[PDB]
Design a protein around this ligand. Structure first.
Ligand SMILES: C=CCOC(=O)Nc1nc2cc3[nH]c(NC)nc3cc2c(=O)[nH]1
Ligand SMILES: C=CCOC(=O)Nc1nc2cc3[nH]c(NC)nc3cc2c(=O)[nH]1
Ligand SMILES: [Zn+2]
Ligand SMILES: [Zn+2]
Lengths: 371, 371
């Protein structure tokens, strides 16, 4: 039987790594992309379709699930895996980001965050870890605070310091719960905004506590790709080399490629699902908006090389019609293609690192995608 | 290779019949239920899922398709079958009903109907048959007028007489187009409101023209089940026994059972798809509204006996959550179950007629469904 958690690196090229995370519910190939399963569904896809695209693990939103249908209710029904019909690993976020971005009103303190639903509710390190346990999460995220951008050095420091205190509370809550500690993994989240010294203090604090994996938090919050890459340049080397590195909320295909070049192993983002429902399809020649009139009689598939079931059967012209008409099948087909495209990107990244040709792949990818 | 059209009756019980329609694109088992594929999609289902539920044929809406994406455009793209990815028979309606129920403004005359889109457009017997040809329909419906209910005898007669003149024009238009006449079938539509003498005149006119199948039009327009059954009692025996009998726009499960008892072979209705998206699931114990709070923690499948993929995997509690949350997957799962339920109903009808026990099946079905 598989271990609780084992990360093995099979090949490296510069800062990039490829390998596997073994967990009780399955193997995760890295670098990995996690489709987002917001409120117990990857929007518009059956779980079998999510798996057919190549996904090894999905993300669940703790903030949404604790509000509807409720964490205790999901536990009573047998846990999130049984409830939604996904039997492979699930990573749950902590709620610390979505509570601040989606709640109508919030009250922040050293204890946690009190908030009104968009009903009064509470999130703290202890309650977040408990909710993730009730959901039956395989990878549990420490409860943190995503510092707004831009941030002054003083405010970034105060925020990061609170997050590190919350990281220790998250560790202790996770470890106190025997079944969770034995069957799940816990990741810590680095903060510190764009400041190298704060990023280093945060990395040091997280390594002293000790986690199964380490996320670079506080990015993709408005700073732009150049600045995100500059922060990753110094931030990723601060994290333990032998554990996974997770960049949450990222991103566009070129964001992912450049982040892998900087040592990131795991990603999640709503872009392929949400923008798919809006009509944006990803292709190796860049994104297209299928709503555009130029696609009304285009018999080609969404992408000329994509191996997904959508590109094997249906034309741009048909999908154009469905999206223009507001048809559910349009959202279904766009989403399946986009998630499959993201998985094919991850597969090409993994294969190119394994073969020592990732630098060339990244150059060729960018030249064609931006042509 | 299969013929253009062959209807064979394999077994009978009273007025009920079971058998097959053979056409170039496939075999249709009768009595048959046709899922409705409005604007080139059975809403929320891939065609492969429609087929997996047991459907042999689907219906397409001529009124919607001529407006978006357009009939000429669909023909340029290779026809409706290729466009939407359904390679089995498609029956198209004529537009004569939806033009009057959905258009913002209409002008009726002996030539046809001029209307404004909900852009000015025209429908006549000749244009309707042409549009159905451009779509590549396998079963073409004559262009008719569905008399409003209630109707005075005078107005029902005048309306029926116009429909019979339009039926002859539809026949001649279909026959003039060699490729259509050789590869598709044409059905005529009986009118006459609730009046036996008008129903007989209409049946006589349609049989004199000659069609491949005969529909009972003008019902399910507000008259109620008792009156619909009373009209079917005398109307179906007026139609040629050796051709299929089609009751369009019907209906609830008990409507279908009683209509088969009266000699109907084919049905279509938006009820399973549209009401599925709204939260109504059909079960052998009657319909349920999955939104109801009583299902929030119910781990049973939608129906205890249903063989569909939804009932094999997901609980009422999960589907309750999805529909309450407005999630696309909720519409997908409800629709697949409801269409599968309708197909299982048709299969039980066909098997019970084949075995000479349909009368008992109808009694047992109604006793449990209405308990
Ligand atoms: C999902 C993983 C677990 O994350 C947490 O528990 N907290 C957390 N979530 C984030 C989410 C982000 N999305 C973006 N941009 C779209 N930037 C983000 C930054 C953070 C962050 O600093 N912390
Ligand atoms: C679809 C088959 C082809 O039908 C036509 O070309 N015309 C036609 N459509 C109808 C549709 C109906 N729906 C209901 N109730 C929901 N009653 C209906 C009656 C008619 C009718 O009399 N004619
Ligand atoms: Zn594709
Ligand atoms: Zn079912």
């Amino acid at each position: 039987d598989r271990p609780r958690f084992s990360f093995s690196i099979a090949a490296r090229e510069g800062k990039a790594r490829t390998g596997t995370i073994e967990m009780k519910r399955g193997v995760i190939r890295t670098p990995a992309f996690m489709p987002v399963g917001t409120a117990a569904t990857v929007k518009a896809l059956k779980p079998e379709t999510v798996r057919a695209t190549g996904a090894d693990i999905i993300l669940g939103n703790t903030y949404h699930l604790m509000l509807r249908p409720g964490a205790e209710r999901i536990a009573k029904l047998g846990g999130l895996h049984s409830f939604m019909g996904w039997d492979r690993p699930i990573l749950t976020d902590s709620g610390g980001y979505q509570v601040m971005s989606l709640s109508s009103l919030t009250k922040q303190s050293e204890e946690g965050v009190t908030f009104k639903s968009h009903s009064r509710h509470m999130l703290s390190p202890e309650r977040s870890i408990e909710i993730q346990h009730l959901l039956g999460s395989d990878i549990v995220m420490a409860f943190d605070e995503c510092t707004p951008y831009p941030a002054t050095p003083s405010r970034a420091a105060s925020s990061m310091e609170r997050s590190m205190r919350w990281a220790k509370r998250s560790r202790d809550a996770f470890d106190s719960r025997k079944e969770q500690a034995e069957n799940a993994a816990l990741f810590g989240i680095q903060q510190g905004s764009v400041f190298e010294n704060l990023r280093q203090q945060s990395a040091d604090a997280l390594a002293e506590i000790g986690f199964d994996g380490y996320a670079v938090g506080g990015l993709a919050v408005g700073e732009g790709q150049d600045e995100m890459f500059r922060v990753l340049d110094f931030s990723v080397p601060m994290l333990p080399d032998d554990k996974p590195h997770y960049l949450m909320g990222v991103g566009k295909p070129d964001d992912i490629v450049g982040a892998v070049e900087r040592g990131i192993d795991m990603f999640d983002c709503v872009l392929p699902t949400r923008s798919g429902r809006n009509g944006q399809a990803f292709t190796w020649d860049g994104p297209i908006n299928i709503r555009n009139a130029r696609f009304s009689e285009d018999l080609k598939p969404l992408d000329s090389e994509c191996h997904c079931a959508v590109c094997q059967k249906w034309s741009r012209a048909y999908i154009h019609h469905l999206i223009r008409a507001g048809e559910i099948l349009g959202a279904m087909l766009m989403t399946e293609h986009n998630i499959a495209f993201y998985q094919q990107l991850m597969q090409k990244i993994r294969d190119s690192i394994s073969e020592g040709r990732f630098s060339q792949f990244a150059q060729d990818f960018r030249a064609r995608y931006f042509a």
